Design a protein around this ligand. Structure first.
Ligand code: ICS
Ligand code: ICS
Ligand code: CLF
Ligand code: CLF
Ligand SMILES: [Fe+2]
Ligand SMILES: [Fe+2]
Lengths: 458, 518, 458, 519
């Protein structure tokens, strides 16, 4: 499998192979589905919209609705203004969202389409019904990755909606980053256990992890409500979880509405979850309750109980920067080694943070690469093997070829059922991760050992 | 006062007026209504359609397994072609190259947009050549490419000289045309002129090609199994599990079999013009489809041993599965279905459903043309639409050295009057029964009205519709991806399909949706 | 592996091989650990106590404390009265439990030791300090299984503690059966979501799934408090979850304190969880909240989304009767087939219930056996294979020899880390089961398929 | 004032008085204190001890892989011997029988208790024979068996005559004696008289047996690898990975090596008396232990080629691991340990810890006797205790046909003077340094006082103690089960053990126990 990948490395400067990212717009689409009664709108050629809706359905095994401007060759000459104006008329009439959240594509960005002007022209024409909203962001796919698209859409939410009206709400805003609905649920559960009022946005819980009830509901029950999105400007503080996905929105809200913010790691593992809980306690004066302390102590108990199977294990990790920074720290906390650590999303922070935690732990000889791909990691593995691989579905090819215990993590995970009901954040998510990691390690040991070395207890 | 009226009701006036033509009801009185097809998508309507790049790179060209396919664009165009379309490939002869597990891109960035991407494209072609030494390289345009000034035709021609293998450019920017269809046409043009007929292989006896067959879920291997058992040489399948060299030698055949009319009819027509090779419409899906196809082939070759072997193989294949066939009919008869796929499968799956006793009430295509709905006889009447007028048309002429008369005109006329579909395709509507409805570019709104009014037992579509339908308590099996199963073509495919369909209908959880407190 | 097991089936009458049960006392020990500040006491030879403590630590990766009478050959002659009287003096002085919960062994039962007399003699001697308690049950290991031992200890709790004082508490008692601490936590969570006051007993949550805090705490935070065990006589109703484990206690409480009871299946899967939620709603007039309804609908969503991998799958199941009855029903609900269904615990109920659900589903050709063992099931598998095996750790040998996807379930699970944090009960537990089942089925498919049949999406 | 006083303080007066003798401190002034050992367990004290059935079936006999071992009892006695003790087995020569993966029992029910269990036992023996055709069948008593009147000796004898293979009964009811120890003795008696010397194999050159070695985690295979490289014939290991036939031919050796003194010394003594075969105490755990053992063996054989190969193999084995050994010492030196195991390993693991720079401050055994603590020289002074007096003693005499002089008397005396432990064992206390404490039958109370007062870096014990110790933030590695690793014996075992130990100490979570919202 992957037979064409050589052991001997010739460094590529132009040919991208098996990327560890996708493009901005699906991140903006995902963020928009975290708004209640929102139809995401893809302003470009319809291929984009179809592909982006499709990956969400493949990952979540759920519907994922979005409209498109359906550019033609004419639009490629005259711009997409006529298309989006037509689209909005059809969307409100046929599908009646409360808000259309527009993002763009490489096509409309190359063309320089002026969304603010189109939207003002829509309003002037009466195309936006009373009580309805159209918002936008710009998501050029030749910049950044899907993480950047998410970040941009959150900025667009703030730009259009957040308002400081002087009516303090006593809440903390939380921007959870590009994490799954189960992670959003777990973060909300922790706020609630701390007894801290909050506004989470975006929030895809109850949108991309919903029930079957026998009736299809185009706009699921979940998502942050428009009125609460407006009210984010009346909050005390914003917690930005994962700088790549969340800081742009947090900083925009500070500038617009004078809401201060604090940047935190995505809360995966011991220190990152601890830092999140401490930030909550420090911001509010609220004590950490026994239930949360119990969960942390159960995680520590599990880390110690399972320790022998973790110490010194070499791990290859690929994924999105916020999650992989925090997961790498957790790998170190477990006594294991982040050996090969890659993201396809550009930016210096990943490099700095990963390098710093490796140095603190005294770990030499790891490879950390920004704008690396799955081809890179496979080549590295051919030169020095690893004990564990953690990535999205596309790692499965390497795992099979190289016989490496494999943990599905991040996005997209398109080949298993129910993963989207499990958090990876918090003490609870950390417990699940340790179980999964040790299960796959032990499964391999027990499949491959000689019969005489087979064990009852482990 | 009918279902068409009910679908149309909620549209705003401008949209209603344009959508009306896309929906027709077949009746005894008027069994062959004209439909509107292959026009622009209405913005904002929630279409299932994709783009020209999908049709060219994702669909027709990608399955060629020993060609390195480079997407010239930002990353998503590449990423979204990484394994989602299930053409299966294996190393040819156990040893040949296979790039199915990879996607290749120039990963365009801001500076490529501002200054052009031709330097990075050249460098990527050379890196791919040096690393992989493939049979050929393809370069596929995406949305920004034309607009930023990149001449990929010139880059490809330069690179091909500098590396010594073929490099083929495809100007399949996604906004071209109105759907995946333009991408088929763009692929076919370059395949015809630059690949087919470039080989040197000696033609074998009883040589056929399967055109417009992409080995989704192993379909092509299953049809080849039966064809080879009868005695045919399967010279090439365009393009499922294909090697580049087999495409180059596609002219070494006596008969082209057209499975997917929409995507490959361009090449079927041009091979007949240039080489004299006749084509028949085939359908390797469903027992009735397969049997009819094999008997039509036998009539074309008119070889006594081939005719006998055809009946022997048919009889043995049917005997092995008849108990399964009987079971599917017992479990499914009387149930109703809708079918909505891209350009072919809404039609080709109908005979199988009919054999199971399932009544197909609704069918449509994302992007098929009037000829796929109404038959090729309407081609002279098709109006040239402004949104596809710039898709290039090429003309071929007989190759003076290679052209041959394969089937003489007298025999051709005889075969046609006997019902053999030589250079013909009657279209989907003809096969549907009276009092059924056709919906071109069916959107979410349309689908919901159909579901509410007709309450079908099952609705076959794709991944974007599947869970929408199933959230409402109705089974939806995917006719693109096969729900990660296959083959669904051929005799073994009928069995695979039928068991999956029965398993879907009889899943117990469908009856558990309402909680006991409600 | 298991090379001595032949294909040709033997109907053994005497030799038990690879049993699907263990003896009563560990079940009583487990129940006793579900009482706060309780030290379990094994009245027999100390080998029993050591073995029984050991299996609990191997399963939970936790301490499991118990004392023993440490019979000698003298006791085998004079009985164990002197031993237990000496034990109680050392237990209260050194270890200071609030309650000693005594169970017996085949030795003390064969000898006919008279616990009520010994306990009355300790009181008379002044060996039981003020405010402290000694209770007992009788747990002959030649009767029943560890499930029966659990049931008997619950009866002992009722016999000694439960009292109707005329002061109605407005609560429902729940006896959760021989289920893990995670299942106890989930059942409590459901009562709390329903807003129904309750007393759960025994309750090993916070006892056999506890945190590491850096100080060893002999009596962990969890366990039902003695005062609440007394107060069970003042409740409105007892729900007995799992007739084998729980009915004896519920019936004893009805006789002693006039608290009515209702018997329910262990709540695994759709109908069994539904029946539990409906019993709660019917008993209290309380409506089912949206959160519980969402969880059920997510389970249905998952059952439908994952259906193709489940339909017609043949399953071999071995374990304890309450859990295996309910799991077998869930297998049917998933569209799969309980092909081989075995418990080591005696009793006709299992046979009747399993046979009846198979008949209702029209399933012919399954083998159901009471007092069957892992050797039986292996022999059956050699004659007609299965697609899935669900059992405790000891099934792993069959799973490897026969190459069957394997789900660890029940007791003891001694070879994985963190399993004891996941419930199997409720809609939440059902979701986890479907994920685990489909994961192991898909893992095998993707490891064994040819390369050309390897898939991205599943 | 001292740690013994601190341990004793909380005991009630009766218990204090009896426990005091089980705890002794070795000092420069009194380096060889007498201990009390092998007495009854105090009821209610929270002991780690097991029963005589464990010692007989679970420990000595179970490892014989081509014998079907039938527990005559209710189900738990059988279930709790299903794989928890990690003796490893493989089919002999790739083809022989192996029942390691199975447990067998009569699954006694109330009817058997009320009416007798002998017919079910007979029927189970016949089912085992007809299904498995093993080399032999064992029948093991449990708590109820004698009390209900079942004569398993008679059942076995009747069955053996019918089926034509040996059937061996063991009256190892759990309440006999005070611990696992009685079960060892009961097993040894029947193995000696009814198994050993029943074979007819031709003795090979340089033949040794390893006695009291059970191949936990592969230990015996690792010993054997090195012994066979030097040129010994490993005639039998009692009983790790043993076939029944090898035990039958245990008399076909020139030297017995005693690894576990407690469990097998009975057979070592009896083989010397009956056959003339000498024994030496051996210790294949730790580099220093192994090296000394191999050098003692070479002294006994006094063969120039064996001696030469002994030194070549020692040098090559050590060279291959010296970098690991250096790392263990670097990472562990200066740390402190306690050891608490059953009857041997508290002692045999000491030299390895000492080589790593670890200071063993506390050691004890569950069930060892005074000779294991103080050395065999104290045997004549050991008082016969009432709770073990009915464990049978058998006597053997020189076999008039098979007895032979292996090492002449004058040479034995010369070898002893030279330090070779022929028919001797110095005991654990001798090896411990001054100021250390020994605790016999250490209970939970005692252990908690030790942990609080001494704050050791690590505490080696078993599964019941492990998590108690680790909940308190102290590493505990299991010296019975090896935490599901091994071999820990032999040269490769030192490396396995050391890496596991370093990995345990340096696990990061130990430093993460206090949450950041607390001091
Ligand atoms: S090529 Fe076409 S949409 Fe003919 S673009 Fe599409 S693998 Fe469909 S109905 Mo996906 S005209 Fe093939 C098709 Fe049919 S990708 Fe496949 S299933 S038979
Ligand atoms: S036989 Fe004994 S308790 Fe010598 S009953 Fe026990 S496999 Fe221990 S210290 Mo478990 S006298 Fe062996 C023993 Fe040592 S079971 Fe093992 S580790 S060396
Ligand atoms: S209609 Fe088709 S798929 Fe769309 S871009 Fe255009 S050729 Fe491509 Fe590629 S990178 Fe992403 S998915 Fe687009 S927004 Fe820029
Ligand atoms: S001290 Fe030892 S292990 Fe204990 S019984 Fe006695 S021989 Fe056996 Fe077997 S069945 Fe269970 S575990 Fe006992 S209580 Fe009856
Ligand atoms: Fe879903
Ligand atoms: Fe633990």
């Amino acid at each position: 499998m992957l037979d064409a990948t050589p052991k001997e490395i010739v460094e590529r400067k132009a040919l991208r192979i098996n990327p560890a990212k996708t493009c901005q717009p699906v991140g903006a689409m995902y963020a928009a589905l975290g708004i209640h009664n929102c139809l995401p709108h893809s302003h470009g050629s319809q291929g984009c919209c179809s592909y982006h809706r499709t990956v969400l359905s493949r990952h979540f095994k759920e519907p994922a609705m979005a409209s498109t401007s359906s550019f033609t060759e004419g639009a490629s000459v005259f711009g997409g203004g006529s298309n989006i104006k037509t689209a909005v008329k059809n969307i409100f009439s046929l599908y009646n969202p409360d808000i259309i959240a527009v993002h763009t594509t490489c096509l409309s960005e190359t063309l320089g389409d002026d969304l603010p002007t189109y939207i003002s022209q829509m309003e002037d024409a009466g195309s936006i019904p009373e009580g309805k909203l159209v918002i936008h962001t710009n998501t050029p796919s030749y910049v950044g990755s899907h993480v950047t698209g998410f970040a941009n859409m959150v900025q667009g939410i703030v730009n259009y909606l957040s308002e400081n009206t002087g009516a303090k709400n006593g809440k903390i805003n939380v921007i959870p980053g590009f994490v799954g609905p189960a992670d959003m649920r777990e973060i909300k559960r922790l706020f609630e256990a701390m007894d801290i009022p909050y506004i989470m946005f975006p929030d895809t819980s109850g949108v991309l992890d919903g029930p079957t009830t026998g009736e299809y509901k185009m706009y699921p029950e979940g998502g942050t409500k428009i009125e609460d999105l407006k009210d984010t400007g009346n909050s005390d503080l914003t917690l930005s979880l994962g700088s790549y996905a969340s800081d742009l929105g947090a900083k925009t809200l500070e500038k617009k509405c004078k809401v201060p913010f604090k940047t935190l790691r995505t809360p995966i593992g011991v220190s990152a979850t601890d830092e999140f809980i401490m930030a909550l306690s420090e911001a509010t004066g609220k004590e950490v309750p026994a239930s949360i302390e119990e969960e942390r102590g159960q995680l520590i108990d599990l880390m110690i109980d399972a320790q022998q199977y973790l110490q010194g294990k070499k791990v290859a990790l690929l994924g999105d920067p916020d999650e992989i920074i925090a997961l790498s720290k957790f790998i170190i906390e477990l006594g294991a080694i982040p050996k090969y650590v890659v993201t396809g999303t550009p930016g210096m922070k990943f490099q700095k943070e990963i390098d710093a935690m490796l140095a603190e732990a005294g770990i030499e000889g790891s490879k950390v690469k920004v704008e690396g791909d799955f081809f890179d990691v496979h080549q590295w593995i051919k030169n020095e093997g690893v004990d564990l691989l953690i990535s999205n579905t596309y790692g499965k090819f390497i795992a099979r070829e190289e016989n490496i215990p494999f943990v599905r993590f991040g996005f997209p995970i398109m080949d298993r059922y129910g993963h989207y009901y499990n958090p990876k954040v918090g003490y609870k998510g950390a417990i699940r991760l340790v179980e999964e990691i040790t299960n796959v390690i032990l499964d391999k040991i027990e499949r491959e050992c000689t019969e005489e070395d087979f064990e009852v207890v482990r | 006062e009918n279902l068409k009226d009910e679908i149309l009701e909620k549209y705003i006036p401008k949209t209603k007026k344009t959508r009306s033509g896309h929906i027709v009801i077949k009746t005894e009185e008027t069994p062959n209504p004209e439909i509107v097809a292959n026009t622009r998508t209405v913005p904002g309507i929630i279409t299932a359609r994709g783009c020209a790049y999908a049709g060219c790179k994702g669909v027709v060209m990608g399955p060629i397994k020993d060609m390195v396919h480079i997407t010239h664009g930002p990353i998503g165009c590449s990423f979204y072609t990484w394994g989602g379309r299930r053409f299966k490939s294996k190393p040819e002869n156990g040893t040949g190259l296979n790039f199915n597990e990879y996607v290749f891109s120039t990963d365009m960035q801001e500076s490529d947009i501002v200054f052009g991407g031709v330097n990075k494209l050249k460098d990527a072609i050379h890196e791919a050549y040096e690393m992989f030494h493939p049979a050929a390289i393809g370069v596929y345009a995406t949305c920004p490419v034309g607009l930023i000034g990149d001449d990929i035709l010139a880059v490809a021609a330069t690179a091909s000289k500098e590396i010594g293998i073929p490099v083929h450019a495809f100007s399949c920017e996604g906004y071209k045309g109105v759907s995946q269809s333009a991408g088929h046409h763009i692929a076919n043009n370059t395949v015809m002129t630059d690949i087919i007929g470039k080989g040197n292989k000696e033609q074998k006896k009883y040589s056929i090609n399967v055109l417009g067959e992409y080995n989704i879920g192993g379909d092509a291997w299953e049809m080849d199994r039966v064809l080879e058992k009868i005695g045919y040489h399967v010279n090439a399948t365009l393009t499922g599990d294909a090697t580049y060299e087999k495409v180059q030698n596609a002219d070494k055949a006596d008969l082209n079999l057209v499975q997917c009319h929409r995507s490959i009819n361009y090449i079927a027509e041009m091979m007949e013009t240039k080489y004299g090779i006749p084509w028949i419409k085939c359908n390797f899906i469903g027992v009735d489809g397969i049997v009819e196809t094999l008997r039509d082939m036998a009539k074309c070759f008119d070889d006594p041993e081939l005719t006998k072997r055809t009946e022997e193989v048919i009889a043995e294949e049917i005997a092995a599965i008849q108990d399964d066939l009987d079971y599917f009919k017992e479990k499914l008869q009387g149930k109703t279905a809708c079918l909505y796929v891209g350009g072919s499968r809404s039609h080709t799956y109908m005979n199988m459903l009919k054999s199971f006793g399932v009544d197909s009430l609704v069918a449509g295509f994302e992007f098929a043309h009037r000829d796929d709905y109404e038959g090729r006889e309407v081609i002279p009447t098709i109006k040239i639409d402004a949104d596809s007028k710039n898709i290039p048309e090429i003309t071929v002429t007989p190759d003076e050295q290679k052209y041959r008369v394969v089937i003489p005109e007298d025999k051709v006329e005889e075969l046609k009057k006997a019902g053999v579909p030589l250079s013909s395709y009657g279209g989907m509507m003809k096969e549907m029964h009276d009092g059924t409805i056709l919906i071109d570019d069916m959107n979410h709104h349309d689908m919901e009205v159909v579901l509410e009014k007709l309450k079908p037992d099952m609705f076959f579509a794709g991944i974007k519709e599947k869970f929408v339908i199933q959230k409402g308590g109705v089974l939806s099996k995917q006719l693109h991806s096969y729900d990660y199963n296959g083959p669904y073509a051929g005799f073994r495919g009928v069995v695979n399909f039928g068991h999956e369909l029965v398993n879907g209908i009889y899943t117990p959880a469908w009856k558990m949706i309402t909680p006991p407190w409600k």
